[PDB]
């Protein structure tokens, strides 16, 4: 039969990773049991949750087998040899779900991406549907695993994950940098978010002791493969294309959907600036806006870098739409649409028609003049201020992008200010 397998919470900060484990499980399945139908899926889940370190994606894949139990046995064996069971934050979970049952898991997945789940909820479902499963310690990985199976993808994207040879690991990656930029120039946007031009920093390359060499995000299989032969790196051992929910904003909740705002959720909401932007310790810029939910703290953190500049150009009254996560009662800006800019009438002194300098007061009710010449005016000149802010959309730079964060280049809308 066809059976969805879902895994996660397998890696540790030490140097394993769900997906690598999944690739192994896949390889072992093909040779013992059956074959993998289509591609595996890398499903990003609610990104505010603690216990990440880092990112938050479970993995799933479809297979064809004669016996469910053996398939469980195989996955089970793979976990036992590869999973970082030593760590206390690592808590592998796995599930095995009939095809026509995964659909019943869509709401659960959705709550996993947008909301917060308890283990008892995952456990309730497994008993509800007699879903064969593996819980290895704390059965926490079970949530992500159910989710990796229920997730419906309307918009989806691809990532070509390259993997290192084990003898390398914990060592420093070796790679040709220009090799990557060149590739982005050639194929962007087909492949996207794989490098940060404006910050001369490659982005698809982890800084971490795991098996991943590079993960390249893109749109088609043909473009990804082009990316792969175009790039120069230390020997690639394992490679896998994943269908994902990277770059879809699948985690954002519309304001029309909710009564109050909550920590550990992410939003798209519209407001008018109350407080003006004010800088902070690390290099942060705070400000506040009025919304159907009252005053709300919006922040661009230092890692957003230049994106802070676009923000600093904010003035009370501005109509805005923000995109980001709420933690500690503040919105971490990922994206931002300035809808309507606030008009500001100002009455200043007359400019002198000869010299160009502002006329000084001519005394109480004596109008104005420009002593330097024999020139005079009697009234003030009103005008509208002209700041360097165009309406429309602005995003953080690719080196600050969050896995779920939908990048402008992928949104049809107008006014997109993609900086390169
Ligand atoms: N919305 C949610 N509510 C509650 N728990 C959730 C959740 N989304 C995921 N989880 C669970 O939290 C744990 C996630 O931590 P995990 O270790 O698996 O990193 P994951 O994808 O983030 C990682 P990495 O690439 O390093 O290897 C999982 O057990 C997962 O099932
Ligand atoms: N996998 C990529 N191509 N980009 C990932 C972005 C990571 C930024 N911290
Ligand atoms: Mg994990
Ligand atoms: Mg996971
Ligand atoms: N589904
Ligand atoms: Zn003058």
From Swiss-Prot:
Q: Which UniProt keywords apply?
A: ATP-binding, Cytoplasm, Ligase, Nucleotide-binding, tRNA processing
Q: What is the effect of changing residue 352 to A?
A: Almost loss of activity
Q: According to its UniProt record, where is this protein located?
A: Cytoplasm
Query: What is the recorded phenotype of mutating residue 249 to A?
Result: Decrease in activity
GO biological process terms on file: tRNA wobble cytosine modification
Name the reaction it catalyses: cytidine(34) in tRNA(Ile2) + agmatine + ATP + H2O = 2-agmatinylcytidine(34) in tRNA(Ile2) + AMP + 2 phosphate + 2 H(+)
**Which cellular components does GO assign to this protein?**
cytoplasm
As recorded in UniProt, its EC number(s) are 6.3.4.22
Query: Record's InterPro entries?
Result: NA-bd_OB_tRNA, TiaS, TiaS-like_TCKD, TiaS_FLD, tRNA_Ile2__agm2C_synt, Zn_ribbon_TiaS
**Top-rank lineage group of the source organism:** Archaea
Q: What is the effect of changing residue 164 to A?
A: Decrease in activity
One molecular function GO term is:
ATP binding
Task: Tell me the function of this protein.
Answer: ATP-dependent agmatine transferase that catalyzes the formation of 2-agmatinylcytidine (agm2C) at the wobble position (C34) of tRNA(Ile2), converting the codon specificity from AUG to AUA.
The protein's name in its UniProt record: tRNA(Ile2) 2-agmatinylcytidine synthetase TiaS
Organism name: Archaeoglobus fulgidus (strain ATCC 49558 / DSM 4304 / JCM 9628 / NBRC 100126 / VC-16)
The gene it comes from is: tiaS
């Amino acid at each position: 039969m066809r059976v969805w397998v879902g895994i996660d919470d397998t890696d540790s900060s030490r140097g394993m990773c769900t997906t690598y484990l999944a690739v192994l499980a896949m390889e072992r399945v093909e040779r013992e049991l059956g074959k993998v139908i289509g591609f595996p899926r890398l499903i990003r889940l609610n990104p505010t949750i603690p216990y990440k370190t880092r990112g938050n994606g479970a993995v799933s894949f479809l297979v064809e087998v004669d016996d469910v139990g053996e398939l469980v046995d195989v996955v089970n064996e793979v976990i036992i040899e590869h999973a970082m069971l030593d760590d206390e934050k690592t808590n592998p979970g796995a599930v095995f779900v009939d095809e026509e049952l995964a659909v019943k898991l869509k709401p659960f997945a959705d709550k996993a991406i947008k909301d917060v789940l308890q283990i008892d909820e995952a456990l309730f479902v497994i008993g509800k549907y007699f879903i064969p499963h593996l819980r290895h310690k704390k059965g926490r990985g079970l949530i992500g695993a159910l989710a990796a199976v229920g997730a419906e993808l309307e918009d989806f994207t691809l990532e070509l994950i390259a993997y290192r040879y084990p003898e390398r690991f914990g060592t420093e990656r070796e790679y040709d940098e220009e090799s990557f930029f060149d590739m982005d120039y050639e194929l962007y946007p087909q492949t996207f978010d794989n490098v940060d031009w404006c910050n001369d920093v490659v982005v698809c390359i982890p800084n971490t002791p795991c098996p991943v060499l590079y993960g390249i995000r893109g749109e088609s299989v043909e473009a990804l493969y082009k990316a792969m032969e175009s790039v120069k790196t230390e020997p690639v051992d394992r490679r896998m294309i994943f269908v994902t929910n990277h770059a879809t904003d699948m985690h954002l909740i519309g304001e029309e959907e909710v009564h109050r705002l909550e920590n550990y959720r992410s939003y798209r909401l519209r407001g008018r600036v109350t407080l003006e932007p004010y800088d902070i310790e690390g290099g942060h810029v705070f400000f506040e806006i009025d919304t159907k939910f009252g005053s709300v703290k919006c922040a661009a953190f230092e890692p957003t870098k230049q994106f802070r500049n676009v923000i600093r150009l904010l003035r009370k009254g501005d109509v805005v739409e923000v995109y980001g996560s709420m933690k500690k009662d503040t919105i971490n800006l990922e994206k931002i649409q300035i809808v309507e800019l606030a008009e500001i009438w100002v009455e200043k002194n007359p400019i002198c028609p000869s010299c160009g300098r502002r006329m000084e007061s001519a005394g109480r009710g004596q109008g104005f003049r420009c002593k330097k010449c024999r020139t005079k005016a009697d009234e003030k000149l009103r005008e509208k201020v002209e700041r360097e802010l165009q309406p429309g959309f602005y995003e953080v730079p690719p080196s600050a992008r969050r896995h779920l964060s939908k990048p402008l280049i992928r949104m049809n809308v107008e006014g997109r200010h993609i900086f390169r």
